[PDB]
């Protein structure tokens, strides 16, 4: 009857690294290999009462008593130097290839059927649109999450590393290439073709992505943030902790991968929000809602089951979404 | 004393068992209640009990903790108490013994029926002896009583030929004269149950936690407690502990192993005292072991002299432990780079750097090898003695009396031993 | 759950929870009147006794520091 | 039971995954029975061919590391495990928990025989080294130190020195060799003394309670801690008889049919970890077998220590 | 009657050590004795629910409510440094002799018959094929596992250590040597001869295996993950824990041994997988299915019993499989 496999693990294609962020000067970004790393510092904040009260303690006496005793805490903070106006963020991306092949599959017939489905997808529509959208998400600095919102000018330089040397170099104005439209550009089409060759398994692709953004002299930068379980008094009320590798502020690799995956413009809701990250059940953490509800027949699992088991091939956009989920990888499969 | 009252007790217990199984099952159809009341209220239930006993066994050393696919012979044996001193085992277990049950996990009702204390003590000793009170309350006929007695007594005996499975452990022990014995050991479930009870009382008992709360408020208490650090949990059943034994069902795995660990089981790192002036007070001084040793020396410096001989002896092996840890600390610095002492710096403890880095003499054939050979630096012992004088309590009462004289004498002995250790470092 | 009151102290939970590992969690914060003392992220399967035992040590060290700070002066 | 004519220092042996489950009640360092059995296997494999006897082992534990982890919210510890192969039906097998640890030890082997005069000391020391380099010590492989900075050579020293000064210097230099470590000794007499003290403290106290008290951290109210003379670990002291001695062919599923099989159970004793400078002679650290098969008591211990 | 032994065991021949992981730059692989180790770090990940729903959690309100609860985890991660692109994996391998000798066995006639069977095998063709396949598994970087997947170039250097020095040195290109085909090469034949001489000897032959994989600058490496049972504790734990020996990421010894054992290409099912690890009942953990089932006459126990008791010698490939199981070891014997 060809039921789906209980173990259907997939490995992650498009492996990023932790994005180390450094600082320097604009028009000095060509020779930016010696730029000092952005360091995570500690500073003291004093917070006031600025949240909603629970209708019990809205009386003036208790509010004034709470205001008379503000809370003190220490936060990790990352800023540019006062004589440095631009931020350099550098990471390496590796395109693997072999997306349809699962890492673990306990059902052989299901694995063969899934491989046939991915193969006929590749024969019909190869990794051309998906690689194009990944090339867009590399060209604009979407991996600069909050470092891009108010930047004066953002420039992204992508170098193809063959045998330790730059085989081909790209240069993009990341503010001209928007975060909303997947347009056509010749250099960006060459980058898309290289990513396509990486995804198709026809070659080894390793890209070194460097982004320069003018934020301002001494302005705050936004690395990745760690979770804090206990605050206490032994630690000096550490409320926020930023991510660093070796005394150098950094962005998590999974945040970079999420920024690359923001290619999904085919969800049933309106695209006024724009692209979203490719996830099962189309979820957005900031929006608190799930596009591609399982009640509708447009989530990843139902589309994959219809495509593979009942041979119901969805629309080409939904096929792109399913193959992007396969590229993303997961612990797909039931118990 | 009377068989009538024992019959009354056993009928009562099967009555709570009957009403409990009727309430738990809640049989409203399928004629389950009639079958339950027609099979668990008379001597037929004793026949089923005799049937179920043959599948179960009371043991004290079981084999099933060793690989659960192993089918071997479980034993109910208490070893004899040896004449050799200073060793523990199952032979200490006397009246504080709990018997394990091995077999099916659904027939354990006959175990709690057989371990009853009706008139003051267990049924096992009653059925072993020819007691008039027993051997008649369970059977009207003599032959039925005899067969039930043999059935209920054979549960403590070894069933089948003695066998230890392949997955069980068998360890050769060399005999004194040209021989070996095979020594297949069994898991002492009685010992681990007794130690589990003791440790549970020490870590979660009411008096123990009351003592912990007394210490938390830094107040007095008539008794103290124990801490038991670095305990390890070894579970036997992954999800079905009852497939091993009933005692392993009471404690779901949880062997609660004790930490037989060496002192170097938490080796942190090795670091070079680069920009500091004297290692014993600056880098050697804040390792946790020597910090504990100097705090114990601080506490023992101001102490009564009622047991002064034992106190001085304890302080003698105390300062011996500090000097031993100093020697160990130099030995673990010996694994660093050969020439860390030649690094630039205003304060690098050049007087003690001859002893801190012996290996510099290899690269420096004429710069520092001959100096270390000819000088033979033993003023490092004097500097460490000065550090210890800085680390002892500044009590003028000891200094005026002969207590400081004895302390200085034992310090002189330990430092001359330490200096003799550092003397022959060039060999 | 609900706030735990221990004398002058209060352990109030966060209104919204979170998932640490695969288990639901809430942040429990300890107060001494208006002074926030410590915050702990605790499993939802904890009862009130376990939440109280998590902050018992901080309460005990507060008590010790209060006894040593405001100890009456001694005449000899 | 005998005085060795020489001491054989097996150098720093890196042991990969040693059985950290020493006894049914203790974990951590492997049992001394493992080391004594390894030395007896060395004698059985190469000691006979060299016309020597290898009895007695000194354990120093230059480095220890157990594959353990502490779960969040618990103060106890658990053992990291291995993924065993699947069953014949493709399902995960039942997990049997075993503790595996990394060691670095150097062993002092007691040597006595005519092969010491028959063969050079360096030759027999070497041949014992490459014999031990293909063996196991506590269930784990032995790492043979390839392509590091420099290997540690084996060194055999005859105890019959030319003078007392020469013997003392040789003992101190051998102690300097195995310096970053702690010698392991047994404290049966100390355990009995503490048990008598505990019995005068309160009666009907077993030696198990004395062994537990000597290892646990005791807190006493005025809040101090009862100090311990040394490290004082609890160690398995051997095996005690649990069944009558069967014939070699009686027991089903035995290891062989040429050796009698007797069921036993662990004996738990007291041990101590101490620096090698605090021993008079390095031969006092040697662990020996003491079988006495008439009453069971299949024991290993280190006599002649104090 | 030659009854089979009740207790049967074989010592693990061909046992490797833990694969120490260290990092450096390519074209500096020769001076890699001082390469800094790869350290296991900590980072926080915030994901979203992406597993299959059980038809009762598919309500949109419950799905949105469950997404509104953040999913936080702490994972162990191992990365190459941001200026090093080459991962160096080094371990030591002991090829023990007395390969066919059981460690424990009851019946002495069974001893003689089994040793006679192994003697017939060794003087018929010996360990020529088995050591060839083991040398192939050493020559290709199969012990890197996921580290071998997306590497630009992999080179394996194998040194024979006789006393304290390199008696004979090898150098291989791991990506050129296939993971499923066992060809013949001169250096590979020399390595196979050395391994077979070690298996047939009375002592042991020591090899150190050093593999350099050009993963990428600052990419994420894959040490062996540690198996820790949660055991139903109420606190949330770290989801991923990596293995390290002394502040240095490592791969488990049994993982390397399973990589070396992947020589079995004679199982009754088709070689779509290729070689599999030599195990009784042909189990594959990644495929969740045990080939060489006892219902067919190709499992290790039935093949051995037919070979030694009834003298029914199997095919040469099945003899190789049985002797490879003898190399692997195991606790055998019925009650």
Swiss-Prot record, chain B:
Residues 69-90 are annotated as: Disordered. Disruption phenotype: Mutants lose phage DMS3 infection-dependent inhibition of biofilm formation while there is normal biofilm formation in the absence of phage infection. Decreased production of crRNA in the presence or absence of phage. Disruption of the entire Y.pestis-subtype CRISPR region disrupts crRNA production but does not alter phage resistance (possibly OLNs PA14_33350 to PA14_33310, and the flanking CRISPR loci), indicating this CRISPR is not involved in phage resistance. Keywords: Antiviral defense. CDD domains: Csy1_I-F. The keyword Ubl conjugation does not apply. Belongs to the CRISPR-associated Csy1 family. CRISPR (clustered regularly interspaced short palindromic repeat) is an adaptive immune system that provides protection against mobile genetic elements (viruses, transposable elements and conjugative plasmids). CRISPR clusters contain sequences complementary to antecedent mobile elements and target invading nucleic acids. CRISPR clusters are transcribed and processed into CRISPR RNA (crRNA). Cas3 and Cascade participate in CRISPR interference, the third stage of CRISPR immunity (Potential). Involved in crRNA production or stability. This is CRISPR-associated protein Csy1. It comes from Pseudomonas aeruginosa (strain UCBPP-PA14). The lineage of its organism: Bacteria, Pseudomonadati, Pseudomonadota, Gammaproteobacteria, Pseudomonadales. The gene is csy1.
């Amino acid at each position: 009857i060809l039921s789906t496999a209980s173990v259907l693990a997939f490995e992650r294609k498009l492996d990023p690294s932790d994005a180390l962020m450094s600082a320097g000067a604009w028009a000095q970004r060509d020779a930016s290999q010696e730029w000092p790393a952005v360091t995570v510092r500690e500073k003291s904040v004093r917070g006031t009462i600025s949240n909603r009260l629970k209708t019990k303690d809205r009386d003036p006496a208790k509010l004034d008593a709470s205001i008379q005793s503000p809370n003190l805490q220490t936060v990790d903070v990352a800023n540019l130097p006062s004589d440095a106006d631009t931020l350099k963020v550098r990471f390496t991306l590796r395109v693997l290839g072999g997306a349809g092949t699962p890492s673990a599959c306990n059902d052989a017939a299901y694995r063969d059927k899934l491989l046939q489905t991915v193969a006929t997808y590749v024969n019909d529509q190869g990794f051309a649109e998906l690689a194009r959208r990944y090339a867009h998400n590399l060209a604009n600095a979407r991996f600069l999450w909050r470092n891009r919102v108010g930047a004066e000018a953002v420039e992204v330089r992508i170098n193809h590393i063959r045998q330790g040397e730059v085989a081909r170099a790209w240069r993009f104005d990341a503010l001209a290439i928007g975060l909303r439209d997947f347009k056509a550009d010749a250099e960006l089409d060459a980058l898309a073709e290289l990513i396509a060759s990486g995804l198709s398994g026809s070659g080894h692709v390793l890209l070194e992505v460097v982004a320069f953004a003018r934020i301002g002299d001494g302005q705050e930068v936004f690395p990745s943030q760690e979770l804090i379980l206990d605050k206490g008094d032994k630690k000096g009320q550490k409320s926020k902790t930023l991510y660093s590798v070796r005394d150098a502020a950094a962005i998590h690799s999974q945040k970079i991968g999420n920024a690359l995956r923001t290619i999904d413009t085919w969800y049933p809701d309106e695209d006024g929000l724009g692209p979203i990250a490719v996830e099962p059940y189309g979820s957005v953490t900031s929006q608190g809602k799930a596009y591609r509800q399982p009640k509708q027949k447009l989530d990843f699992y139902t589309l994959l089951d219809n495509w593979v088991l009942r041979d119901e091939a969805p629309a080409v956009e939904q096929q792109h979404y399913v193959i992007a989920n396969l590229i993303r990888g997961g612990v797909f499969g039931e118990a | 004393p009377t068989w009538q009252e024992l019959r009354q007790f056993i009928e009562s217990f099967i009555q709570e068992r009957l009403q409990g199984k009727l309430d738990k099952l809640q049989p409203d159809e399928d004629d389950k209640r009639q079958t339950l009341l027609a099979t668990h209220r008379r001597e037929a239930w004793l026949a089923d009990a005799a049937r179920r006993v043959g599948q179960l066994q009371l043991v004290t050393h079981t084999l099933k903790p060793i690989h659960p696919d192993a089918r071997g012979s479980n034993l109910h044996s208490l070893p004899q108490a040896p004449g050799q001193p200073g060793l523990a085992g199952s032979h200490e277990l006397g009246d504080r013994l709990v018997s394990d049950v091995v077999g099916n996990a659904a027939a354990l009702d006959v175990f709690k029926f057989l371990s009853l204390q009706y008139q003051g003590k267990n049924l096992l000793n009653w059925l072993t002896e020819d007691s008039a009170e027993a051997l008649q309350a369970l059977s009207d006929n003599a032959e039925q009583a005899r067969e039930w007695r043999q059935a209920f007594i054979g549960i403590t005996t070894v069933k089948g030929a003695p066998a230890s499975h392949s997955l069980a452990k068998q360890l050769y022990f060399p005999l004194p004269g040209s021989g070996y014995h095979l020594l297949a050991p069994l898991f002492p479930t009685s010992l681990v149950h007794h130690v589990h009870a003791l440790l549970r009382e020490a870590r979660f008992g009411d008096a123990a936690k009351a003592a912990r709360e007394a210490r938390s408020r830094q107040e007095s208490w008539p008794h103290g407690f124990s801490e038991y650090p670095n305990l390890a949990i070894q579970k036997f059943g992954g999800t079905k502990p009852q497939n091993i034994s009933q005692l392993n069902n009471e404690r779901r795995g949880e062997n609660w192993l004790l930490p037989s660990l060496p002192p170097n089981w938490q080796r942190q790192n090795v670091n070079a005292p680069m920009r500091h002036s004297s290692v014993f007070e600056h880098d050697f001084g804040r390792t946790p072991e020597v910090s504990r040793l100097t705090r114990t020396l601080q506490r023992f410096l101001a102490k009564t002299v009622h047991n002064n001989l034992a106190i001085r002896q304890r302080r003698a092996q105390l300062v011996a432990q500090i000097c031993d840890e100093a020697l160990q600390y130099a030995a673990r610095l010996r694994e660093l780079e050969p020439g860390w002492s030649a690094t630039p710096g205003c304060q690098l403890h050049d007087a003690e750097q001859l002893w801190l880095d012996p290996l510099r003499a290899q690269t420096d054939e004429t710069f520092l090898q001959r100096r270390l050979r000819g000088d033979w630096p033993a003023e490092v012992g004097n500097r460490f003695a000065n550090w210890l004088n800085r680390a002892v309590s500044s009590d003028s009462q000891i200094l005026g009396s002969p207590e400081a004289a004895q302390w200085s004498q034992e310090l002189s002995k330990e430092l001359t031993m330490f200096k003799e250790i550092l003397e022959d470092e060039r060999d | 759950m609900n706030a735990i009151h221990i004398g002058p102290f209060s352990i109030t939970p966060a209104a919204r929870g979170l998932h640490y590992g695969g288990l639901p969690h809430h942040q429990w914060t300890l107060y001494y009147g208006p002074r926030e003392m410590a915050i702990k992220t605790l499993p939802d399967s904890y009862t009130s006794s376990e939440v109280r035992d998590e902050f018992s040590d901080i309460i005990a060290e507060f008590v010790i520091d209060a006894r040593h700070r405001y100890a009456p002066d001694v005449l000899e | 039971v005998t005085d060795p004519e020489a001491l054989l220092l097996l150098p720093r042996l890196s042991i990969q995954n040693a059985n950290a489950i020493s006894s049914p009640l203790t974990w951590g360092f492997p049992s001394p029975g493992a080391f004594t059995g390894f030395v007896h296997a060395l004698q059985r494999r190469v000691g006979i061919s060299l016309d020597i006897e290898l009895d007695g082992v000194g354990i120093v534990c230059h480095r220890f590391e157990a594959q353990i982890s502490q779960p969040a919210g618990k103060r106890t510890k658990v053992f990291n495990l291995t993924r065993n192969p699947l069953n014949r039906d493709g399902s995960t097998a039942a997990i049997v928990e075993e503790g595996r640890a990394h060691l670095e030890v150097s062993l002092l082997l007691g040597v006595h025989g005519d092969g010491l005069d028959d063969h050079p000391a360096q030759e027999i020391a070497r041949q014992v080294q490459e014999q031990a380099g293909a063996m196991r010590l506590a269930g784990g492989s032995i790492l043979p130190w390839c392509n590091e900075r420099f290997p540690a050579p084996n060194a055999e020293l005859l105890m019959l020195g030319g003078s007392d000064e020469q013997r003392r210097k040789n003992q101190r230099r051998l102690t300097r060799r195995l310096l970053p470590g702690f010698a392991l000794v047994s404290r049966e007499a100390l355990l009995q003394q503490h048990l008598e003290t505990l019995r005068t403290t309160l009666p009907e106290a077993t030696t198990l309670d004395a062994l537990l008290d000597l290892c646990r951290i005791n807190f006493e109210p005025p809040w101090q801690v009862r100090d311990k003379p040394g490290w004082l670990v609890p160690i398995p002291a051997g095996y005690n008889a649990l069944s009558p001695l069967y014939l070699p062919g009686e027991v089903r599923n035995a290891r062989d049919r040429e050796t009698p099989l007797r069921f036993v159970e662990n004996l738990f004793g007291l041990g101590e970890w101490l620096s090698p400078h605090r021993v008079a002679a390095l031969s006092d650290l040697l662990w020996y077998h003491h079988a006495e098969p008439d009453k069971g008591l299949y024991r290993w211990s280190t006599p002649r220590f104090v």
